[PDB]
Amino acid sequence: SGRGKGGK
Amino acid sequence: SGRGKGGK
Amino acid sequence: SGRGKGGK
Amino acid sequence: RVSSGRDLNCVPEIADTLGAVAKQGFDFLCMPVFHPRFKREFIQEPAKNRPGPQTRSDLLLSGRDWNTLIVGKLSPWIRPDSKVEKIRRNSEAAMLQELNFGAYLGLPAFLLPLNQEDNTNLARVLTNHIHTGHHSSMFWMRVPLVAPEDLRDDIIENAPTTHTEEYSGEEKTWMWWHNFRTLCDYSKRIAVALEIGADLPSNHVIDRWLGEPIKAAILPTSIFLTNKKGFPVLSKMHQRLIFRLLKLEVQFIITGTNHHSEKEFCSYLQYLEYLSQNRPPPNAYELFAKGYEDYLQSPLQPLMDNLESQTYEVFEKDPIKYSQYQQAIYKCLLDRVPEEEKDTNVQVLMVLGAGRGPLVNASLRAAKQADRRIKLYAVEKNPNAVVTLENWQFEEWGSQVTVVSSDMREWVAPEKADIIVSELLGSFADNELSPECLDGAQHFLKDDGVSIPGEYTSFLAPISSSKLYNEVRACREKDRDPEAQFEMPYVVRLHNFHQLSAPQPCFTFSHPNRDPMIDNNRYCTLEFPVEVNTVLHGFAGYFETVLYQDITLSIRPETHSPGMFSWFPILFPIKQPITVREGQTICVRFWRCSNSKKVWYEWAVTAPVCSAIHNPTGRSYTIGL
Amino acid sequence: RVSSGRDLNCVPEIADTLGAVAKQGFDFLCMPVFHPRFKREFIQEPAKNRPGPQTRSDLLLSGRDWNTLIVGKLSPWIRPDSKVEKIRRNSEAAMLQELNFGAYLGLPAFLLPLNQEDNTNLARVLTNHIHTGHHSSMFWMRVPLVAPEDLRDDIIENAPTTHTEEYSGEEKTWMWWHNFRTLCDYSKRIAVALEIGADLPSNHVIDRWLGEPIKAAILPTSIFLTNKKGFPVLSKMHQRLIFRLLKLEVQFIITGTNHHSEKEFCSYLQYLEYLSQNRPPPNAYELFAKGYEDYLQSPLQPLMDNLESQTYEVFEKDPIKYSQYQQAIYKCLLDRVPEEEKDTNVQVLMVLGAGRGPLVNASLRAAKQADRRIKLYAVEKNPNAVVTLENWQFEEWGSQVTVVSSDMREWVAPEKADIIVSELLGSFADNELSPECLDGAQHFLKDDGVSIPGEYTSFLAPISSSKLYNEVRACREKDRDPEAQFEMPYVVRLHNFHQLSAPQPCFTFSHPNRDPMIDNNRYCTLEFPVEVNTVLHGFAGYFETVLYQDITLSIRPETHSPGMFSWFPILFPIKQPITVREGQTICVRFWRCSNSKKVWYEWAVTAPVCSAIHNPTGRSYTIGL
Amino acid sequence: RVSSGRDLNCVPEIADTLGAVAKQGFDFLCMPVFHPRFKREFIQEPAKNRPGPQTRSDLLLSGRDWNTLIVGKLSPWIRPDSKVEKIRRNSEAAMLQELNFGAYLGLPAFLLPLNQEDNTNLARVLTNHIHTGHHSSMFWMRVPLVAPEDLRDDIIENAPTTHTEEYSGEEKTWMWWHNFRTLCDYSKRIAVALEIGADLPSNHVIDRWLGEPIKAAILPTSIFLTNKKGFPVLSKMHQRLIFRLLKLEVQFIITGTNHHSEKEFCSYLQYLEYLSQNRPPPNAYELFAKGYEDYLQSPLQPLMDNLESQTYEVFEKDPIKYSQYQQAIYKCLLDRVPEEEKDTNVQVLMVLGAGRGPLVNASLRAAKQADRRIKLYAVEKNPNAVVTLENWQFEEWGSQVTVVSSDMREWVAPEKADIIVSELLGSFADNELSPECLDGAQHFLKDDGVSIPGEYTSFLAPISSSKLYNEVRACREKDRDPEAQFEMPYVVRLHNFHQLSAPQPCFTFSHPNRDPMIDNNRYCTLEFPVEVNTVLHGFAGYFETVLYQDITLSIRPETHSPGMFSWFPILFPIKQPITVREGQTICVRFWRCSNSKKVWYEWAVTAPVCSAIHNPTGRSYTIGL
Numbered sequence A, B, C: 001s002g003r004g005k006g007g008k
Numbered sequence D, E, F: 001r002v003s004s005g006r007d008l009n010c011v012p013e014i015a016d017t018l019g020a021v022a023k024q025g026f027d028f029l030c031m032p033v034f035h036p037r038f039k040r041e042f043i044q045e046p047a048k049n050r051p052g053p054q055t056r057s058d059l060l061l062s063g064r065d066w067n068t069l070i071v072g073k074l075s076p077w078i079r080p081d082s083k084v085e086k087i088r089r090n091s092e093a094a095m096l097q098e099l100n101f102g103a104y105l106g107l108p109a110f111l112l113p114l115n116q117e118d119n120t121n122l123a124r125v126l127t128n129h130i131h132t133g134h135h136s137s138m139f140w141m142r143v144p145l146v147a148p149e150d151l152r153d154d155i156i157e158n159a160p161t162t163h164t165e166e167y168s169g170e171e172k173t174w175m176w177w178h179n180f181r182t183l184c185d186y187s188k189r190i191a192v193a194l195e196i197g198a199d200l201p202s203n204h205v206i207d208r209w210l211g212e213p214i215k216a217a218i219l220p221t222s223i224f225l226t227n228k229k230g231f232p233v234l235s236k237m238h239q240r241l242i243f244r245l246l247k248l249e250v251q252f253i254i255t256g257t258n259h260h261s262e263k264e265f266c267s268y269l270q271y272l273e274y275l276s277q278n279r280p281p282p283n284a285y286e287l288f289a290k291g292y293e294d295y296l297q298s299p300l301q302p303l304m305d306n307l308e309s310q311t312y313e314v315f316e317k318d319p320i321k322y323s324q325y326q327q328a329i330y331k332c333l334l335d336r337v338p339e340e341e342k343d344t345n346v347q348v349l350m351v352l353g354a355g356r357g358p359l360v361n362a363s364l365r366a367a368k369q370a371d372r373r374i375k376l377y378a379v380e381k382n383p384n385a386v387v388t389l390e391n392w393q394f395e396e397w398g399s400q401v402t403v404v405s406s407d408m409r410e411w412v413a414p415e416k417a418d419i420i421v422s423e424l425l426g427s428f429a430d431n432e433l434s435p436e437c438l439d440g441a442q443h444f445l446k447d448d449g450v451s452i453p454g455e456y457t458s459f460l461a462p463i464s465s466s467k468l469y470n471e472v473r474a475c476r477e478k479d480r481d482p483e484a485q486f487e488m489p490y491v492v493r494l495h496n497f498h499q500l501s502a503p504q505p506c507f508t509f510s511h512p513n514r515d516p517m518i519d520n521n522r523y524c525t526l527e528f529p530v531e532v533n534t535v536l537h538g539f540a541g542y543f544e545t546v547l548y549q550d551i552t553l554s555i556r557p558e559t560h561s562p563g564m565f566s567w568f569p570i571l572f573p574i575k576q577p578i579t580v581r582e583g584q585t586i587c588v589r590f591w592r593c594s595n596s597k598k599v600w601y602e603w604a605v606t607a608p609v610c611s612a613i614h615n616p617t618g619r620s621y622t623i624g625l
């Protein structure tokens, strides 16, 4: 969300 | 188990 | 030479 | 809702104590693993040869209970930083013994004190245990807001308490923590158990802990006030600190004896539950962003990559954004077509980067409410989204909408536009390459044409967050520069952090661009006044945009559009943390760079100290054209 | 219990079809994402400019439904390996288009056929899509056990079917899969959708698929037989294949039309459920090992490391192991003390590596059932376990047991032992360093003394498992040799694999050791006859031990102690897979090496081809002394 | 010129022997470090306790002499692969002892025999010493062309010699070497000391050693023939082998006793000097390429990068290339302008990628010799070279030449050209992106216009070279994929290698390109017949170009333009070596891929075995547009 992708 | 540790 | 650069 | 534990230093029977504690409503017990008075000798005979079991058996509880209900506590006599060599040596051996027993038991956490300035040898022994076997357990450093020496009663005749303000001096316990974690090289297994006193220090001492990895808050029963009914309560200032800690989802720890003797023990815990229930309910944004607090994400690149169906579906869930676009188009149509030209004047509207069609629908709603005639083109380069658009065009829109599967920079438009509408904005405004895209589309906008958005500005603000610094640090990947993770921005819902100075404008772009050869490259110097002692870890990025005249969108905290969750802030980290003293200025330099293939940012801190230039030539991060 | 899907090539209405399929009891639907007959042109005008939507909208289903209920299918006209240049080019563009739409939709899996020998360009286009964006989706390669060309009816007059055995020829479809996955460099996102025919091939063709990543089994309705009641059933041989596939937990896919017209459709799926319910229930070992199938683990090192409480608790859950030790001690006591010496002869028993006390309890039970007198010492180097032992000694055992907190190699015993009892065995027998430990303890055993165990032997067997090879491959870590993961053994409950030759003995140790200067270093050459075409990926390791006389423990599959789950097999991988032809010999070389600090294994394959020597000088793996 | 050593197995006095050997003209001495008959015991008493020094002192020679003049020799009794356990153990300890003494002495090289099929334990002990301390010394594996068992006199009555051809059997000693070096994992410190016998084997046995790291050639005195004067000489076939070895710059080793008793000893070495002096002198190309033999280089990228002054200076040193361009322009001018139009017809010539001006000068010389009028444009994107061009234009050329500082793909030409002349060719023809560059320039060439070059074709040939494979292997760099070095081409003057099949055409481009939308992407399958037993390590790449009609340039070995050294071949390696048997076919697949930003190659071997696809999506190597 909030213009982001990926992460964990 | 089976004489092992760790992994994931 | 011979169309190459770099190496060593 | 509230996760709470009991802290005891006396456990005569482990099974009986756990039961009593669970009955009181506590979720865990912080307790000694070896008797706290049972001092042990490792070097000198005869005491080193003391027989019998050194402690209680692991058989007293199930593995599940040791793993979930018990937090270990370091024995109070263990003094690795003692001036006495013999105590120092016995303490190192006892500390290693107790930490190894905790790991043997599978304890979820182990408590260690920070109760003096020098904990060098305690850090060394802890770092050594961390680099020995099983890497799961957490170490909770028990550190007070106010050091015992600074809250002692003024009862020593020849040693009065200092009644003078010592700004940095009252922040001393933070430096105890800072030095300790620096020594242990920011291990993620090392966190804070913040102990709260009867009297709170000044706000600057409390705020010093912002951005710190606080896992627990320790509340002694002696800090609780008594109400008319005789039940434990807290001062308004203490409640204000509890609310801040509840947002960090800390585990609360109740220490000390029952001081509300004729009012039972669970009453302390019942009060925390009361405060937890009686807090402000989260807004639309807060309910939406739940789970994303401090979660680092890669910024979306809708130009270089084709977004997925669910990504467009997330965009579409924001009601505020599109109702703002509709209002901007509505006002523009009224300004361009007088009432008398209502039925003859057909405005040519181009939605540039149409996605799945919400701005096309927003344009049609805008034309209906303005009672004006429009001719629409929906331009989209992503062919997958073009499927949705073409199915919408056949089923609903009809001939009024012409769907164009093309890059706006290449499209040979058959007619010029009156209005070009786009939403190509990132969290840092121009980071999705809206300037480059609209520059290429500019030639098909009429001489008196309007671009929605008309303008956008990015903003930067210095931040402190050892929590986020450690989060970026853990993003080291194989087959790349070991420091690349610090040379790239992250989209992140900033939560456990301290904003150090007011956001200042960084880069501005205006559409249509009437400065020949454009030059979207930029260089900005920003000077941020800092009124606190702190540590700089990066820059928070935000933006504002003028859609049309007074119709705007903003993610800048001070002017944030209410209920709009399409963009979280961006974070530009720095490789090495920078110490900043109160009254100093943070000077940052930001560049917007490009070639014909890529666009990137480069950044550097030049005051109070210089950093390296981050991301030179886009070596770690680039935005594909 | 059984996860099953429906395969369709005709979906007139997506919502109606999914509903009908869900009602039938299926969990998923394999379906075309673009109409299977809708051939598209990308290069030549006028057809390249075909208007309208290229397919159905993503809006037809929820994101959850696309993510969980739909498996995409590649269009049948897409032929990237065509002899025609134009078809090859249009197919590459269409394949990339369809795979990108599948990723746009968030499909959990996408089906692609392997229906001819040459799929070089299909692999190239697939590898290219894999190295482009979102890396979550699975690719299921639809490959038959028996190629359509080899099961065609013998009805062509001038082209008779081959009635001769072609051993390797009938294994052709495995080579289609093997070459494809080699080309795509063993991507873990590439798996097999094995299609089953009306007639099964020879066992060697079926076994060729052992150790392969089978994610799905495709069952055409045409392979089902009919019973007296008119319901679909399967031949005994087909049922035998279903049972093998159920152990691999494959998802079953039902393809084709209803051939049991007057018996409804869910009947095919009801039969699979029947077979699933009517299977042998798992034994004590199988129920214990559930979750550990092919799960790679680090072998425990109880000497170098101090085991955790829960590790000892897992050891203690094995009822067979200790009842065997008790029987071995019981027989030894009877052989050493005649009935007439019953009340005067006190045997000195030392439990060397006592852990939390089960062998101490086993020794006392053994002495009670033998009606003999014992004097016990429980020696343990782990101080954490020593806590449990000392609490047991005070509370229960008493003076009969002397707990010793020491390494058996350093302990100055005050008396010599009649029997030394130990359980210092790893999955490869000597891998926990039992020889080095018992060699150091040997000096305190009497001249006529007995060691339990008296002997142990390790065993090796060559194995094939592309599943395990890929599992080891994914263990590449930062800051170490990129190939170190292949130079170390793993404890693993081997499941999806093929044992290629009978286990052969590798290394033997006997206690007490009466060959002066001992020399625990070893070198063994083993020659394994292989009767199949296969691929060698590593060696399975097992062991047997003689506790006393006929009382043994074994993990060797052929002589496995029933219900004993203390040890899973060990796996020694090889860096590069080795092709083995039927009738060839696998020659392996194994070394047991040491210095005064560490012990390690080194290994190499020398026939049919040489491998590198693995783990030279213990560079990737060592066992601490 | 020739570096030669003496091999002795008897050195009674080290200082006296070295002196005698140096006087004879030898540069080094291969000698035992321990007495070759002095068998030592390490395990059994009393012999293990043998007193006195185990060998000669290091003090007998200077450090410089040990470092430069002495090659150690392994004792002949050391048999690590013995069937006897005791010999195997004593040999491992003695081998480690002797290798450690050699390293103690700082010996430049140490000789070890390969004199039987199984050297598994010798490889294990050697690999272990290599991974222990100082990594400078070389190990020379003494291996014969023909095994002693295969050259024994036919004098055993009940054991006749085999008079039948055993194709693979006669290549046995190569497999001894191959297995040994595979076991030692291609250490670069492990090389071949090839021993030559009285009778040479068939050419296929000799050629088997092509591409192998031969550091020394061993010549026994017994292989030398005697001439009319009584001096040692060699057979014509032996001389042919000496000449091949001289090109590899091997060190020659003279072993055995003086068999030319009444003709002195240095005579053997005098003959080698004679052969060395009496060899063909190197040509213009060979003298130019001296130092570049097997030297891997990055292929130049004149589009993405701006070449340096000295790079253009190297280009300009090739007299053949430009005289060919001049001849091609000369013929074109005569074909385009009839004699009668001589003074009225001015041909517009554009040199596209002019560098420092040699093709501009070649065009003017061509126009003078054709007696025709030309109007020249010299287009160059490199601004540094534009400086040279503009200084030439002012000082010499004048108004006849218009220098254009532009990319030919962007230049708005003010006039159309009659002829476009370019030299944008790499070692693999299209690897510098000549197709993309000339495609963009095509629009300014007249309808009947000529492009020089008119056409070019790349060629590929499979090669064997364990020397080059190891050279690519050593190109592993930090912060990139550990296998990226195998997924990129190298410009290399191939020297120690074996070409396995005749070069076959890969990709062709024609200018002007009259196949709308061009499509410079390509896919080629090549099938190479192989008549030898070998190991595949990569593909040699070459090209041919038609400048105009019969005027060509070629680097294809069979049609190589004489004296032209502008391009060395290119090498496409493969990650894993592939065994190829005589009569098998090597099938390779090559792709030319692109996007709007980059061009790259992808390649795979599909027969006799599949390799992974190399460089998918240009992950390791790309050519910037």
Ligand SMILES: Nc1ncnc2c1ncn2[C@@H]1O/C(=C/[C@@H](N)CC[C@H](N)C(=O)O)[C@@H](O)[C@H]1O
Binding pocket: D302, D303, D306, D307, D312, D315, D316, D352, D353, D354, D355, D356, D358, D359, D379, D380, D381, D382, D385, D406, D407, D408, D409, D423, D424, D425, D432, D437
């Ligand atoms: N040069 C371009 N030409 C056409 N579409 C583009 C270009 N660059 C980005 N886009 C698309 O425009 C997009 C815009 C999005 N940032 C917003 C999507 C949509 N308008 C929505 O607000 O829901 C993505 O769909 C991109 O595929």
Ligand SMILES: Nc1ncnc2c1ncn2[C@@H]1O/C(=C/[C@@H](N)CC[C@H](N)C(=O)O)[C@@H](O)[C@H]1O
Binding pocket: E302, E303, E306, E307, E312, E315, E316, E352, E353, E354, E355, E356, E358, E359, E379, E380, E381, E382, E385, E406, E407, E408, E409, E423, E424, E425, E432, E437
């Ligand atoms: N040199 C040693 N001296 C004493 N204990 C050792 C030594 N090496 C290993 N051990 C211990 O002996 C052990 C044995 C285990 N493999 C079995 C444990 C236990 N007897 C049980 O069967 O439940 C671990 O508790 C180790 O700490």
Ligand SMILES: Nc1ncnc2c1ncn2[C@@H]1O/C(=C/[C@@H](N)CC[C@H](N)C(=O)O)[C@@H](O)[C@H]1O
Binding pocket: F302, F303, F306, F307, F312, F315, F316, F352, F353, F354, F355, F356, F358, F359, F379, F380, F381, F382, F385, F406, F407, F408, F409, F423, F424, F425, F432, F437
């Ligand atoms: N698109 C381009 N436009 C103009 N010059 C180019 C382009 N691509 C490459 N070149 C130049 O043309 C060149 C050609 C060289 N391969 C040969 C140089 C020169 N003609 C010589 O034979 O000595 C380099 O000087 C490049 O800078």
